[PDB]
Amino acid sequence: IGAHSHIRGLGLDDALEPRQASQGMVGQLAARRAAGVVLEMIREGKIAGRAVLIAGQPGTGKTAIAMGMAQALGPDTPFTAIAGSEIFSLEMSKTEALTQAFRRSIGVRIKEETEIIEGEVVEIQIVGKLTLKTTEMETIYDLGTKMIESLTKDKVQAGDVITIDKATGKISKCPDGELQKRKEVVHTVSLHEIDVINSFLALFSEIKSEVREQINAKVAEWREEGKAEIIPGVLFIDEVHMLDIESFSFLNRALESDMAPVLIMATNRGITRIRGTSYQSPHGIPIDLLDRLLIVSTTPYSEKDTKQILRIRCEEEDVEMSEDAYTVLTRIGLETSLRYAIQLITAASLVCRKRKGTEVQVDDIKRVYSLFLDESRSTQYMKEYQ
């Protein structure tokens, strides 16, 4: 949840020309160009029986590029980011873990009629009424206190697209048409979502196969009828080197299916022994899968792009930073991981609020740097003890 929710596309303009800062992506022009090539290959449908593996040192946006590609494929294309170690789990075998990971990426866009209570707000009427105008007619559509509060939460009074007995949305003041836009919302429900639906402390105190078969049959029926629309998404497996030979064989088998989503893997080792067997191979992947792999390498980050990334992140976390603070954070992110730099921000915000300030200073940044250790420092300091 959360993480890098600021990229809505690769940002490579057209004809595979990344326009630097755009929809999040603010670097990795080579990797962006390769990702765009891969995306339009997927669109034209000649990526069948292939996969993409993104190599690069930690903190170079390997997951960001995959998220951007998933967004660029479609506004509602499923994205599933798992880790290699995520499969050796106590409840499920690697078979079940990888099956769930795959079905998490196979999205079904199924239409669903709904009476969105919408209308171009001409007057913001306060529980009470609210004047709304559409091509159908104009009338004072009634809303609750919280519905009008959310209307004021969105830009007033552009819009608003108030779904039936639900929240609103800012458009302009101009959503028009019918006051009852009986629009069949195309809900993108992944196969795994339907499976879990058919099957609140459950995690504190796996689905047989019949539920799976019923889900498959029903989804296929809906898609054939024209109600649903099976749209394969993107499956991202970070730490691919952690996977063993047995899971690699299952991945190879699953890539053979027609419903298989685009498979993206990320690795940062090179020439590592395959977890199974005792044979060294690049990125610890059996050559049978490496042969048909489109490899993309993410270059390390430079100071200006790091500072831009931090600017975006603070914009996301509602934190104002001093320019000296931004430079110190940039130098930290160069000396340490970007992730640690991002972690620093939230702690600095509370440190600033402790002294009842409005904008974080360099002093808060240094105080939080002294407070929470990062990966490299903690180890160095521990081994020296031993």
Partner 1 sequence: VKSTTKTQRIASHSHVKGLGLDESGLAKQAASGLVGQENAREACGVIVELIKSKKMAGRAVLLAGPPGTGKTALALAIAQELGSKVPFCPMVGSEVYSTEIKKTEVLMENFRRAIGLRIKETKEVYEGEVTELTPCHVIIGLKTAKGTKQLKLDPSIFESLQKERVEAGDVIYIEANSGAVKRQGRCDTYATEFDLEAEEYVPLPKGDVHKKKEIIQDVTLHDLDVANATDKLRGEINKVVNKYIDQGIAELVPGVLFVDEVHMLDIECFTYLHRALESSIAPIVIFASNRGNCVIRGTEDITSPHGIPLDLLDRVMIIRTMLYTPQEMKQIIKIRAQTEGINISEEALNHLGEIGTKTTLRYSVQLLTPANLLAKINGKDSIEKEHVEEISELFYDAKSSAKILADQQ
Ligand X SMILES: Nc1ncnc2c1ncn2[C@@H]1O[C@H](COP(=O)(O)OP(=O)(O)O)[C@@H](O)[C@H]1O
Binding residue numbers: 56-63
> Which of the listed partners (ligand X, a copy of itself, partner 1, none) does 141 bind, with a CB threshold of 5 to 8 Å by partner kind?
a copy of itself
CA 303 to CA 338: how far, in whole Å? 11
Binding residues for ATP, as ranges, are 56-63
Cα atoms in the Cβ-side hemisphere of radius 13 Å centred on 263? 27
> Which of the listed partners (ligand X, a copy of itself, partner 1, none) does 216 bind, with a CB threshold of 5 to 8 Å by partner kind?
none
Backbone angles phi, psi at 44, to 5 degrees: -80, -10
Give the burial class of 327: count Cβ atoms within 10 A of its Cβ; 0-12 exposed, 13-18 middle, 19 or more buried.
middle
Among the residue ranges 14-22, 177-185, 228-236, 252-260, the one whose residues contact a copy of itself (CB under 8 A):
177-185
Instruction: List residues binding ligand X (CB under 6 A).
Output: 3-4, 24-28, 56, 58-64, 238, 266, 309, 312-313, 338-339, 342
Minimum distance of ligand X from residue 29's CB (angstroms): 9
In one letter, which amino acid is 166?
Answer: K
Minimum distance of ligand X from residue 18's CB (angstroms): 9
Give the burial class of 89: count Cβ atoms within 10 A of its Cβ; 0-12 exposed, 13-18 middle, 19 or more buried.
exposed
Q: Which residue has the tokens 């997951």?
A: 63
CA 38 to CA 36: how far, in whole Å? 5
Minimum distance of ligand X from residue 192's CB (angstroms): 22
Nearer to partner 1, 97 or 310 (CB): 97
Is-contact 70 79, C-beta < 8 A? yes
Give the burial class of 266: count Cβ atoms within 10 A of its Cβ; 0-12 exposed, 13-18 middle, 19 or more buried.
buried
β-sheet with 180-184: strand ranges across: 161-162, 113-118, 180-184
Among the residue ranges 60-68, 132-140, 269-277, 351-359, the one whose residues contact a copy of itself (CB under 8 A):
132-140
Residue 165 binds a copy of itself (CB under 8 A): yes
Residue 117 binds a copy of itself (CB under 8 A): yes
> Which of the listed partners (a copy of itself, ligand X, partner 1, none) does 183 bind, with a CB threshold of 5 to 8 Å by partner kind?
none
Residue 115 binds a copy of itself (CB under 8 A): yes
Minimum distance of a copy of itself from residue 136's CB (angstroms): 9
> Which of the listed partners (partner 1, ligand X, a copy of itself, none) does 182 bind, with a CB threshold of 5 to 8 Å by partner kind?
a copy of itself
Q: Which residue is nearest to ligand X (CB)?
A: 61
> Which of the listed partners (partner 1, ligand X, a copy of itself, none) does 300 bind, with a CB threshold of 5 to 8 Å by partner kind?
partner 1
Mapping DSSP onto H, E and C, the string for 241-290 reads HHCCHHHHHHHHHHCCCCCCCEEEEEECCCCEECCCCCCEEHHHCCHHHH
> Which of the listed partners (ligand X, a copy of itself, partner 1, none) does 173 bind, with a CB threshold of 5 to 8 Å by partner kind?
none
> Which of the listed partners (partner 1, a copy of itself, ligand X, none) does 266 bind, with a CB threshold of 5 to 8 Å by partner kind?
ligand X
Q: Give the containing element (helix H, strand E) for 183.
A: strand 180-184
Give every CB contact of residue 148 below 8 A, 6+ residues apart in sequence.
124, 125, 126, 128, 130
Q: Which residue has the tokens 């590609």?
A: 69
Minimum distance of a copy of itself from residue 263's CB (angstroms): 39
Minimum distance of a copy of itself from residue 126's CB (angstroms): 5
Among the residue ranges 176-184, 199-207, 243-251, 343-351, the one whose residues contact a copy of itself (CB under 8 A):
176-184
**Residue 381 CB: number of other CB atoms within 10 A?**
10
Name residues contacting a copy of itself, limited to 26-85 (CB under 8 A): none
- The residue ranges that bind a copy of itself (CB under 8 A) are 115-119, 125-132, 137, 139-145, 164-165, 178-182
